[PDB]
């Protein structure tokens, strides 16, 4: 186990996460937000047809992007700092190119071809993009020309979101039949499948070494998992809470763990001693997605509040 | 001490934020008149004089929006988890091609007081209700229901459809269902749903302006 082996770890204390920066601006529900890579910029995706990337230091609006279709379920940000990636229901995976275009930011590829709604997208580099839809299957692509290069199958349900380990060469997937599967990016035979929930899994992210990951779900029972073991490793459950858990993201040290819930709190957890490490109130409504930086300096939450909040 | 060279870098944020908010202006001046159901649902003659689907039909000074999916118990997770702000559930239902009724029973048990869309407004239109008066006599609806506890007519039939929606409700009070007795389907329904959405926006005003 993890838990009965945790008999060596001295406790962590109580740390104030001070609510540093409050981001105004929106007018609707916000289904998605995600970072830059120099720990400074933040993409954000909300229901009213606009797409906003952000400079959290000086805290002012950098871009807002018109969509023609007003339905979002994801957006990703290329670690160059040139490509934003906005998804939707209508299977128009719209890749927009920021810097090199002069004035505008317009599409260069609408990856079309998914049958059902397009759930999650994540960038690798300026080359490809990994994507997940309602078509029970997922795919790696080639935006330089627009051919769906590789496509992997296996599930029996709609895919919800998708996740990388930052050495760029493995990916892991979550779909509504309580499935979390491993696929190597290049080959991708049906490697191994992960169960343990009963719910449609609604968030997953990876422990930043490249060796383990963790799943968050709306049956209020988060878990952590090895690359190899296929069974439960560490269970995460407030015994007094049965409203579910919407997003999840590890901190830089791997000592912490975020989780926003349905009762409008983000409990911060010790990643070691299975404790409520601290509490984040202040959300008007439900935490949609939370994001740690690439150095664990700040952390941020996007909710249904039409606001972003910056915790330190 | 930040008075240094970035007096465009915040000025840009004002220029983008005004045009950010003024997209919300011509948001919600419309409403969203959403097509639901299955085949034979009787919303083709509705959409006749009127991605997936939109439209832009207007009548008496109020531009409208309208969207479309179909095929319940698999299309549920779409709109419970990721729709929003619906003022119009057009639950058009086939009346001679069913089955798909406990479909509606467990669907309305799952939607009616769940935290995301407990505040839905489920409006049934028995489109081609002559097919319903034909179907209930060709087939007594005791095949679908144990607790058919009325007479042999249309009033208790349609009222019992309204029952068996909200028989799995079990803890709430009302929905105020605007059942257009749908005529020969080339019939004036635009005025019906017109002042129907007038009354739902009036009750949405009064729920949020003090007066009840």
């Amino acid at each position, epitope marked *: 186990t993890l838990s009965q082996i945790t008999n060596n770890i001295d406790p962590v204390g109580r740390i104030q996460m001070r609510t540093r920066r409050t981001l105004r601006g929106h007018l609707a529900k916000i289904y998605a937000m995600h970072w830059g890579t120099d720990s400074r910029l933040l993409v954000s995706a909300s229901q009213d047809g606009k797409l906003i990337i952000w400079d959290s230091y000086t805290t002012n609006k950098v871009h807002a992007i018109p969509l023609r279709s007003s339905w979002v379920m994801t957006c990703a940000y290329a670690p160059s700092g040139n490509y934003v990636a906005c998804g939707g229901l209508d299977n128009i995976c719209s890749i927009y190119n920021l810097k090199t275009r002069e*004035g505008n930011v317009r599409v260069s590829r609408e990856l079309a071809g998914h049958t059902g709604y397009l759930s999650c997208c994540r960038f690798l580099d300026d080359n490809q993009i990994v994507t997940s839809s309602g078509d029970t299957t997922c795919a790696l692509w080639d935006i330089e020309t627009g051919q769906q290069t590789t496509t992997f199958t296996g599930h029996t349900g709609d895919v919800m979101s998708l996740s990388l380990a930052p050495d760029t060469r493995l990916f892991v997937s979550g779909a509504c039949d309580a499935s979390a599967k491993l696929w190597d990016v290049r080959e991708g035979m049906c490697r191994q499948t992960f169960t343990g929930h009963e719910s449609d899994i609604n968030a997953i992210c990876f422990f930043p070494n490249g060796n383990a990951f963790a799943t968050g779900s709306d049956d209020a029972t988060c878990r952590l998992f090895d690359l190899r073991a296929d069974q439960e490793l560490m269970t995460y459950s407030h015994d007094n809470i049965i409203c579910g858990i919407t997003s999840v993201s590890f901190s830089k040290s791997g000592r912490l763990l975020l989780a926003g819930y349905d009762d409008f709190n983000c409990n911060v957890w010790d990643a070691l001693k299975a404790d409520r490490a601290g509490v984040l109130a202040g959300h008007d409504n439900r935490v949609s997605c939370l994001g740690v930086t690439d150095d664990g300096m700040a952390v941020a939450t996007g909710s249904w509040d039409s606001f972003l909040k910056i915790w330190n | *001490t930040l008075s*240094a060279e*970035d007096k*465009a870098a915040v000025e*840009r944020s004002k220029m983008i934020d005004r045009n950010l908010r003024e997209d919300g202006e011509k948001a919600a001046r419309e409403v969203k008149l959403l097509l639901l159901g299955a085949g034979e649902s009787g919303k083709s003659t509705i959409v006749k004089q009127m991605g997936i689907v939109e439209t832009h039909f207007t009548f008496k000074d109020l531009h409208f929006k309208m969207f479309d999916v179909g095929g319940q118990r698999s299309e549920r997770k779409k709109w419970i988890h990721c729709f929003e702000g619906v003022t119009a559930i057009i639950f058009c239902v086939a009346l001679s091609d069913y089955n798909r009724m406990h479909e509606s029973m467990k669907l309305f048990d799952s939607i009616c007081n769940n935290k995301w869309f407990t505040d839905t407004s489920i409006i049934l239109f028995l489109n081609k209700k002559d097919l319903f008066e034909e179907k209930i006599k060709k087939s007594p609806l005791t095949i679908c229901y144990p607790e058919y506890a009325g007479s042999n007519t249309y009033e208790e039939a349609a009222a019992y459809i309204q029952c068996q929606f909200e028989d799995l409700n079990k803890r709430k009070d009302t929905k105020e269902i605007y059942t257009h007795f749908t005529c020969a389907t080339d019939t004036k329904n635009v005025q019906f749903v017109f002042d129907a959405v007038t009354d739902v926006i009036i009750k949405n005003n009064l729920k949020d302006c003090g007066l009840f």
Partner: antibody
Amino acid sequence: DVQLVESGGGLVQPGGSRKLSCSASGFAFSSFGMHWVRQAPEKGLEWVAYISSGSGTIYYADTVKGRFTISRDDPKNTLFLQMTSLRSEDTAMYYCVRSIYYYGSSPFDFWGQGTTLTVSS
Amino acid sequence: DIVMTQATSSVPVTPGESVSISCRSSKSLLHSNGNTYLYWFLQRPGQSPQLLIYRMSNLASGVPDRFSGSGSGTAFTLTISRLEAEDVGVYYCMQHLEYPLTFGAGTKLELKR
């Protein structure tokens, strides 16, 4: 792609006035700021004027504050520069210069073809 | 106002070798934000100038990487790894700390024979 054609050069009688225009084409003229820059004969170059997005924020240099006028016409993509009280010490080639300002953004990164203004009898 | 300082004329460097040209400041141009706001311009004769180094540290679009910048808090120098036959011409320094902006004075890069 980008064409910044100046117009309005030539000879100007001293102390008089003149408007300049940069026919701008190929780039979204809204979200950019304009700079007027001047290059004298065999001298170091020098900043003159700034206009922002939103058509409001206006800056000048020392000698020509109050006598120059910078404006932009977004349906016409047009930088108007009305100069007044023109004297021999501004006989120069001028340029109109694209700008864009935010974090990780690149000011001045395009330049005009330039035009000649000459103040003499 | 704040004054930039150069050297006006310079040695024709041999085509094929490195070169370095300086410009320094009449005030500490580094602001508390973190990066000093300094500009290196190229102008060819009979042409219109494109920039080379924006904000003291970064090459621009359409410029090869031989234009390695060098910065103190106050003194600044652009170094070219190899003088090619087409980097001929006039160089300018121009700060961006406050308004208004003054520029440098110009420094010529020539050919040695």
